[PDB]
Write a protein that binds this ligand. Structure first.
Ligand SMILES: CCC1=C(C)/C(=C/C2=NC(=C\c3[nH]c(/C=C4\NC(=O)[C@H](C)[C@H]4CC)c(C)c3CCC(=O)O)/C(CCC(=O)O)=C2C)NC1=O
Ligand SMILES: CCC1=C(C)/C(=C/C2=NC(=C\c3[nH]c(/C=C4\NC(=O)[C@H](C)[C@H]4CC)c(C)c3CCC(=O)O)/C(CCC(=O)O)=C2C)NC1=O
Ligand SMILES: CCC1=C(C)/C(=C/C2=NC(=C\c3[nH]c(/C=C4\NC(=O)[C@H](C)[C@H]4CC)c(C)c3CCC(=O)O)/C(CCC(=O)O)=C2C)NC1=O
Ligand SMILES: CCC1=C(C)/C(=C/C2=NC(=C\c3[nH]c(/C=C4\NC(=O)[C@H](C)[C@H]4CC)c(C)c3CCC(=O)O)/C(CCC(=O)O)=C2C)NC1=O
Ligand SMILES: CCC1=C(C)/C(=C/C2=NC(=C\c3[nH]c(/C=C4\NC(=O)[C@H](C)[C@H]4CC)c(C)c3CCC(=O)O)/C(CCC(=O)O)=C2C)NC1=O
Ligand SMILES: CCC1=C(C)/C(=C/C2=NC(=C\c3[nH]c(/C=C4\NC(=O)[C@H](C)[C@H]4CC)c(C)c3CCC(=O)O)/C(CCC(=O)O)=C2C)NC1=O
Lengths: 162, 160, 49, 162, 162, 160, 160, 162
């Protein structure tokens, strides 16, 4: 994976250049947002189970068909699989927020996810809606400061599926 | 199904079904009409079984519908009874199938994670399925009560 | 590192096909024929009146 | 996999319905045919080696070039693989007839079979004629009703390969 | 492993004699108990969790030092190991009761358990007490004859660990 | 036997037996008595079975007991009939067990290597088992003949 | 029924129902449970009533089942018994209705022409329904027996 | 006409069946509501002129064009015929409510009524407004439990006219 610091390092290494003023500016920006990212990650670690609870409850309230007979989330096995996917999404969005980079999202989540969901018949729109529900719950818990940052990675994941 | 289990076991060994498995299939196919009678009898008493089982469960575990419980309130109790109705339908499916497979892929795989996400207490689920056992086996003859209690016990052990 | 693509994303379920209910199968048709005879016999064991 | 019983169960589970009179009628039909199915399966299992004997003999009589030098069935190894594939088809057709459903065929035979054979230069049409040879041999042994039954699954394999 | 029937087959094969009257009497005796054994196995399968529950409760009530600091069962990890061992003992004694023979206990339970516990420092006498506790708990649920049959295998396990 | 195979299958997944698996064991222990009568009938008539099978084999395959054959000689013919006696005892064991497992694990694993070391022709063994099946099924009734010939056919296929 | 009679009477006069008509409807619905149990009791015992009434009918009137009798033979006797069953069903309908209207309009209007076309003696009807009266009022308590006997008497008078 | 009791009698007579547990349930349901129906019918019959007064006042207030010169309710004769028709509707609705069934409505009021009104020039929308107004006027006097039942027959008349 790649984070903001390693991204700057790679950019300047490809050019064979020592760090100039712009590079130090970007590094200062990441170091300045670091404590906010760490607080958000700690809060999400503390409340991940609650986040998945409330996000799944909201998604299944808006789309009751998903957990009723005939829905893709109707069985104990498929309900557990849905919750496991949402747990994936939350944990990896937390990783991407703590890194300040969406590379880990591409290289551990989105690669082949659309093909997997299309092979299984998993509805992409409802998965995107569940990611929005996670976005709302997580943004409410982390606070206004980190909500905007966390929504960036949730939106990245949603746009990757949709 | 029994036929499915026999075929799957034979396929794991890359062989045709032995005369023992064919005899087992003949026995199940001969017991099919009695199984269908039992399934019809349980299906017709759907509402009575669910109502009585809910009553016994809530009297045995008053805290479930007590404040601070997972089933507190009218709508959560209705969801509780809906869950019981699901499992009764699954038990009838298992009766006609001659084994607990459909019960397993519909209601037992991942039920632990599901009810954890729902903060539903698994023990209370166990007393619920035992109350269902009592009520449902009460309306059947002893012989049929035996096989039906077998599926209810599989469900109770799977949830526990 | 030839490819980053997933070779086997999942296995497409065979739970439900489209068409071919197999209820028109002549063996199944004979089954529905014989269950009718069984029902008729059950009717005949009833009192004639 | 899936059988007739499990097929009815799944159809009513997707609808979230307890069994109806139609479901009980279908289940009674399967229970009515179970004994004929078991007899056909037993007589096929007892005579499987003979069926393969004759089917391979007819296929290599009609298509000599398969077993002439340079043919796809020319080596002891490739000939053995050929008759092994025919025994595979016979065993899984017996499984499907005993189950009363063709889902095992799609799941455990046809899935990836066409491109398996295309990556190997196995003649798919010749395999299809081998399957009709097995059909003709099996029908004469199992009797008329069981012949019409086994023909459904043999034709299913033939159509899936074609 | 071997069951009662296979045990008779081996004892007559090693001496190279055909089944005499006594062998057939032993086989009839085993077949007579089959329904009782199957009922007991089903009952234990239904109630295995509860048996482990209340047997472990009795064991740690009689020896509170096992689960207090300094005891062998003092941690969530070691308590989990203890209850896992009791569950495996119950399930394997149920297997042996179904089979009618104690070969599975030797091959899959007592095979290296004594000296594995010796290496781990597990107290043998407390394990024997736990097995006895499961013995009364199972007997209460299975009734007289099934309780005698289970007690045979429980005492075999107790002797093997001792 | 069937009970052992079921127990091993369940221990593979570390679980108690399913209700359907217990039903399978119930069917096995229900058929146990008829299996016992069939094996009793086979073990009572072992001498005549061996005599008739050996005679039929040697008339069909004279080269075995002809000079230059493996079975030529009084002691070698005795060894041949002793092998037939072994395989009859194994067939009885398989009949009581309900499966070919005792048959295989006494007399099928390594049988080709043993008979290769013994110069014993495999087609001769196959014909011996076939004649032995013919005699045994002749002595038994119509119902018993099918399952008794099943194990003999398995043994012949193992030798072939 | 009673309600239909009252409403039709009030409609033929183009008026609302009188206080007395509302009073008779009140009394009718107040006594619905007792007449409803009466119909329940007669319905549970259909087979016994029909069998016993047929026995007394054929013993009182041997000529009906003698050769040349209208009910001679098994199938004509069954037709006799199922006519009796028809009339028992109509009597239950009348009991729940509170009037003899269902009997009057299902099995009375045109009964003479129907049974004349069938060569069925109307007297035979009369003792048949009297025998069914005896059997049916045997099973009921005194007040219920009198209430049911009124309907049976009405039927007997209609056939006469 | 037929009432609820005769409707159940019909359903079981066309099938040649004696009364079942469901039939006894429906008969219990009708007997339970009998005193309510009798009380409501007495109340309506007591206040028929009053109910017609409020209903006609509301109808002619909302539609003064009916009683203006050239309307269908403009003359003493036609005003009287209008309030007479409203009497018809109220009385037959009371009949149907007592019967627990809408058969009397179909046979005695609605049969040919639409074409009769069309030939007379009677406005059917205004007649439905009068019937609805009579429904709200009656429901207040009869009471909620009786109003819910009586509105069934009023709405039956309104739908038959529409
Ligand atoms: C076919 C397999 C299957 C099952 C079994 C299943 C159960 C299930 N129960 C649910 C809710 C519920 N289920 C229960 C029942 C529990 N509460 C009490 O404590 C009892 C111990 C216990 C029942 C006996 C309750 C109270 C709720 C409401 C929870 C909530 O509203 O948050 C939900 C959430 C979605 C919804 O309510 O529609 C599911 C998916 N779903 C499935 O697809
Ligand atoms: C290059 C490797 C290779 C081999 C060895 C091979 C053997 C081979 N022998 C065949 C037939 C045959 N093979 C034999 C030979 C037997 N007859 C006697 O019993 C003898 C014991 C024995 C030979 C010494 C016979 C008689 C047939 C005709 C079988 C029939 O038509 O039913 C066939 C069937 C196809 C055909 O007849 O053309 C094959 C594939 N195939 C191969 O690709
Ligand atoms: C250091 C790691 C460690 C832990 C944590 C531990 C816990 C522990 N708690 C126990 C009993 C218990 N523990 C509880 C506590 C529960 N009561 C309420 O429900 C709460 C939700 C919850 C506590 C917050 C209760 C009620 C019992 C008695 C159970 C019984 O007697 O049935 C026991 C059984 C022995 C005893 O009675 O003391 C253990 C081993 N043991 C360990 O070696
Ligand atoms: C399938 C048959 C089988 C069994 C049952 C078995 C038992 C077994 N118990 C173990 C540890 C243990 N076993 C126990 C249980 C003891 N402690 C309490 O005091 C009790 C008196 C008593 C049990 C009733 C404990 C506490 C440990 C952990 C010891 C340690 O790590 O220090 C281990 C070491 C590996 C591990 O912990 O995962 C094995 C293999 N092995 C087998 O192959
Ligand atoms: C229970 C499993 C088992 C089997 C089956 C078995 C077979 C067996 N047969 C043997 C000898 C023999 N077996 C035969 C039998 C053959 N002669 C004809 O060709 C026939 C086709 C065929 C018999 C139907 C003969 C001729 C010998 C003598 C070989 C010699 O001494 O050179 C021997 C050598 C030891 C001895 O002679 O005592 C063995 C081990 N042993 C076992 O422990
Ligand atoms: C051409 C035939 C014809 C006539 C005659 C006729 C009369 C008539 N007068 C009405 C109201 C009325 N009529 C009167 C008149 C009475 N008030 C006093 O008591 C006096 C004794 C008396 C007048 C001399 C009043 C006061 C109203 C209003 C009542 C109200 O709004 O509450 C209404 C009700 C509709 C409306 O407000 O216009 C009609 C239909 N309509 C017709 O189609």
């Amino acid at each position: 994976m790649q984070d903001a610091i390693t991204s700057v390092i790679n950019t300047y290494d490809v050019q064979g250049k020592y760090f100039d003023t712009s590079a130090f500016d970007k590094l200062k920006a990441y170091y300045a947002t670091g404590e906010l990212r760490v607080r958000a990650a700690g809060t999400i670690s503390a409340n991940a189970a609650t986040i998945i609870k409330e996000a799944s409850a909201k998604l299944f309230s808006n789309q009751p068909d998903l957990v009723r007979p005939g829905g893709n989330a109707y069985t104990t096995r498929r309900y557990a699989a849905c919750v496991r996917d949402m747990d994936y999404f939350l944990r990896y969005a937390t990783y991407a927020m703590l890194a300040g980079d969406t590379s880990i999202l591409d290289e551990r989540v989105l690669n082949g996810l659309k093909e997997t969901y299309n092979s299984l018949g998993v509805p992409i729109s409802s998965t995107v809606q569940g990611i929005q529900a996670m976005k709302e719950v997580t943004g409410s818990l982390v606070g206004s400061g980190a909500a905007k940052e966390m929504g960036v990675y949730f939106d990245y994941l949603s746009s990757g599926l949709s | 199904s029994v036929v499915t289990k026999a075929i799957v076991s034979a396929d794991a060994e890359a062989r045709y079904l032995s005369p023992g498995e064919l005899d087992r299939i003949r026995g199940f196919v001969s017991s099919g009409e009695r199984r269908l009678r039992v399934a019809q009898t349980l299906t017709e008493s759907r509402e009575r079984i669910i109502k009585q089982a809910g009553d016994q469960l809530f009297q045995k575990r008053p805290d479930l519908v007590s404040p601070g419980g997972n089933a507190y309130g009218a709508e959560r109790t209705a969801s509780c009874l809906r869950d019981l109705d699901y499992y009764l339908r699954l038990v009838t499916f298992g009766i006609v199938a001659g084994d607990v497979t459909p019960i397993e892929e519909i209601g037992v795989i991942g039920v632990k994670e599901m009810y954890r996400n729902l903060e539903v207490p698994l023990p209370g689920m166990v007393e619920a399925v035992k109350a269902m056992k009592s009520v449902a086996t009460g309306l059947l003859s002893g012989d049929d009560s035996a096989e039906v209690g077998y599926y209810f016990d599989y469900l109770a052990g799977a949830l526990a | 590192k030839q490819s980053a693509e997933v070779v086997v994303p999942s296995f497409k379920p065979v739970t439900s096909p489209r068409g071919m209910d197999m209820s028109q199968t002549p063996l199944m048709l004979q089954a529905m024929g014989d269950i009718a005879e069984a029902e008729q016999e059950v009717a005949l064991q009833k009192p004639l009146f």
